[PDB]
Design a protein around this ligand. Structure first.
Ligand SMILES: NS(=O)(=O)c1cc2c(cc1Cl)N[C@H]([C@H]1C[C@H]3C=C[C@@H]1C3)NS2(=O)=O
Ligand SMILES: NS(=O)(=O)c1cc2c(cc1Cl)N[C@H]([C@H]1C[C@H]3C=C[C@@H]1C3)NS2(=O)=O
Ligand SMILES: NS(=O)(=O)c1cc2c(cc1Cl)N[C@H]([C@H]1C[C@H]3C=C[C@@H]1C3)NS2(=O)=O
Ligand SMILES: NS(=O)(=O)c1cc2c(cc1Cl)N[C@H]([C@H]1C[C@H]3C=C[C@@H]1C3)NS2(=O)=O
Ligand SMILES: N[C@@H](CCC(=O)O)C(=O)O
Ligand SMILES: N[C@@H](CCC(=O)O)C(=O)O
Ligand SMILES: N[C@@H](CCC(=O)O)C(=O)O
Ligand SMILES: N[C@@H](CCC(=O)O)C(=O)O
Lengths: 270, 260, 260, 270
């Protein structure tokens, strides 16, 4: 029996190959997550089929409707067996699905358009109007937002820290809406907003986008928190312990480090 | 029913208080792990008693004996109910005990005395002038022993065949040996311990290069115990509430007895 | 019995003089390989005739047909008696023809137009901005095809799946493509050819990095022929007498039509 | 049946391990040649034993008696089957034994004691009294010699080049004898002669000795010629073709390059 591996289209985790029109099956996709699935299969023998989540969402719970959407919803309602995707381990998600040990460490970072070089002996220096989350919250000329139906938005919603609470209070009543539907949409907003929009995304995606052309964006400050990506399985499933053991084996063998190096830094430019 | 909490004396995780002679119970202990244990107990809602492991070892399996020692042995053999200590999450340990989600990130680092010719670990393995060792009965030693990476294979080949014994009994003794080696001995240890040592007086040791790999400390529970899910949710809630970051800042950088 | 010698038009190995239209026989050819063939004939004591291979290919076997072309094909199928030419000694060729001892050392080198950002082979593979190719039906292409090293595997994967065809038909064609690419294309060729090109006008190309590997040119002879031992002894005698070094200096640095 | 592999005690080709007193068999020795023999065995399956030539000589054709000695001699007379050792491919040797493709390139170089750095804005410069071979031949205040019963001595003996002929003419009638019995003896002579002795050895050994402590010797100029080391085998033997094919396989596979890098440059003490 073949199990369903749900995932989301997000570079560099899951990207379509250039010649993907003539290919079929799992060979159309490429990235970190497809290699992770291949290594998981190598550890524990099973047949898997790569599928993309229908709504293109990571997962969230509506307050009034109380139905999980995205990959978490797909896993909860039995439409998938395992989610090998950049899914953030959160307390609310852990109560409805099973998470393995983290395979990648990350944190919430800020993305802004890279400032032009300041000419004024004849040294060149780069100065950005945002240096930390606190000054980003204090100012009001640059709008900021997160990804809709994501872990960062829920983190800001349920944060009792004064700075993060202030940012959330600004976000919930910002006209026009500062929330985006996709990471690429947020990066496009940052690029075309001429320095008047800051995107709050994970540090891994931020660094990856900064490492590729045209590299007109930069990451400012440090990470707002420390989290991780976990492989998710439904509650009471027989694939949880083998997946956790496989992740631990890959971590000890150094496969994860080599995968990160070959998918993030060996493919950068500029 | 009071829950026995095994732990090890390792700064800044667990320390003996200055007036611990005139104190009883858990009130004679201080550190990151003490506050973490207090918050875990508050979240779960149980009474706990802090106990120090009889042998100052984290845990390992002896060859041709298959007997666990340290806090891992204290857990597999029913002598303890939970282990709130800087216990590295490893593949070998996870097959006998239940680990929660990591609460602190870390990695293997190199500590030398205060140009830094050694720099990275590859250059350290490329030079026989400087000796390097690890802590015995620890995750770093097992990581080096089982490593299939070529560089780490050469490092393990050196350590296993070296006279005198390049391994050390305790982390404090290892950093002392580094201090008194006049730049001839290098210590391999956890990144958090290295940072804590290098931020303290006399600040005669420094950390060179990045982390060799990345692991985490987890709260360990006996396999099949009923405390695994509650402590896992407690760790997740503490991480999302910013408590773990504030505790690390309090016990690593708030004091800062050095100029940096 | 006149011995048919097959060779390829490559500089400075074989050239068609300047007034070849008014010359017949071997007198219309010049170069390192012509002098080497003259020395080999003088040592062994046989009359020889220089012929140019019909197709300007060094030699390879095509998949699903198992037919050799070029000088290797000229030797395996009995069309030639000996091959004095810059023929790289390779494992696949050695199983079908007899190679003598190498008479010239060489290696695979990278060249671009006139500090180079490309630097070594690893950085060249990493930077997708610059395209790199290889001569068709040569030993470099087969070296990259059969290579199991990861970096060379990436290079070969790029070359096979490249649009337009990153390969070239002749060495001069690749030289011209590098010259007219304005620093966008890099050529992968032999070290000796690279040095000869870079030491000639207009001196717009330079060799970067070191040598990817180390190989040698050998005098090829049909398998199980009576000429193998005499030509091997002749090559050894020429090497010990310093004739090969003298010829290389004459044809590589004596002229030197460049600013260096 | 197990064949006999004859070797020479030369570093870093064949070296004894520190704990070689309690070891037996092929595990006693270490170096480049033992790994070469192991790879040859892996390519073509056979059982081999490592022996050291009795007289400790590479091989030379003794005049008058016309009897070969050393590794070449013991290969000719049947007491050895294959010589995996730094044996130079020469015309005289090729006529009595078989030689494979060269597995390592080399040349004749000059070894002199490293001079002290010159005191003279405040830059420090290194100046040596010998820069090439012809100036070494011209002067007479510095003695120089080669290895007895070696390939370099034979090369100088039959060389018709004017400068090499002049060096040979000086060498044959030099008292006390400038020739040494072992490479280590010549290096000791260079070190203890306080700049009044130059040792002519192969470039590989010269570089290896340069890279190790106390590194008080240096190589001046360039190689006098271009040669190579071959895997010798008796004339009309069945092991010549498999040995040649294995050498080609190792060269194309990159094994030889990594072996040479690990033995010569990885263990650099200076
Ligand atoms: N450098 S990285 O982000 O690619 C990365 C991050 C991590 C890795 C491995 C790598 Cl390569 N393994 C750890 C795992 C190992 C054991 C301890 C924590 C989990 C279980 N999680 S992690 O700390 O999130
Ligand atoms: N900054 S730190 O080292 O004290 C640190 C490190 C980590 C924290 C929290 C903190 Cl404060 N939480 C994560 C946990 C949270 C959820 C996602 C990964 C695990 C489960 N583990 S971690 O990445 O090892
Ligand atoms: N200096 S050079 O490249 O023209 C050159 C290169 C080489 C020469 C001679 C010269 Cl002049 N001879 C050797 C041969 C001689 C004997 C030892 C190795 C082979 C057999 N091959 S080589 O190392 O490929
Ligand atoms: N760089 S090195 O001296 O260790 C070295 C030197 C040589 C190598 C391989 C290496 Cl790694 N292979 C060549 C061989 C390969 C094929 C072409 C010439 C011989 C047959 N001989 S070589 O040119 O003498
Ligand atoms: N990785 C997040 C989504 C990305 C983001 O919110 O920035 C998740 O799994 O929910
Ligand atoms: N904290 C580690 C020990 C430190 C070390 O490996 O030196 C463990 O629990 O195994
Ligand atoms: N001279 C080489 C061809 C050069 C190349 O590989 O580009 C040969 O004989 O195969
Ligand atoms: N390699 C040489 C010996 C060393 C030398 O003469 O310098 C030989 O095989 O004879």
């Amino acid at each position: 029996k073949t199990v369903v591996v749900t995932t989301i289209l997000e570079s560099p985790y899951v990207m379509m190959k250039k010649n993907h029109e003539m290919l079929e099956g799992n060979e159309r996709y490429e990235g970190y997550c497809v290699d992770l699935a291949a290594e998981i299969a190598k550890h524990c023998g099973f047949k898997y089929k790569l599928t993309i989540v229908g709504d293109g969402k990571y997962g969230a719970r509506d307050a009034d409707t109380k139905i999980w959407n995205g990959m978490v919803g797909e896993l909860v309602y039995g439409k998938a067996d395992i989610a090998i995707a950049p899914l953030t381990i959160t307390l609310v998600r852990e109560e409805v699905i099973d998470f393995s040990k983290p395979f990648m460490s990350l944190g919430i970072s800020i993305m802004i358009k890279k400032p032009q070089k300041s000419k004024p002996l004849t040294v060149e220096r780069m100065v950005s109007p945002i240096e930390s989350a606190e000054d980003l919250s204090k100012q009001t000329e640059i709008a900021y937002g997160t990804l809709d139906s994501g872990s960062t938005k829920e983190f800001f919603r349920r944060s009792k820290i004064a700075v993060f609470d202030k940012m959330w209070t600004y976000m919930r009543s910002a006209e026009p809406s500062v929330f985006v539907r996709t990471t690429a949409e947020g990066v496009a907003r940052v690029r075309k907003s001429k320095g008047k929009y800051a995107y709050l995304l994970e540090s891994t995606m931020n660094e990856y986008i900064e490492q590729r052309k045209p590299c007109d964006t930069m990451k400012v400050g440090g990470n707002l928190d420390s989290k991780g990506y976990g492989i998710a399985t439904p509650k009471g499933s027989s694939l949880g312990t083998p997946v956790n053991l496989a992740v631990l084996k890959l971590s000890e063998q150094g496969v994860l480090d080599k995968l990160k190096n070959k998918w993030w830094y060996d493919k950068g430019e500029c």
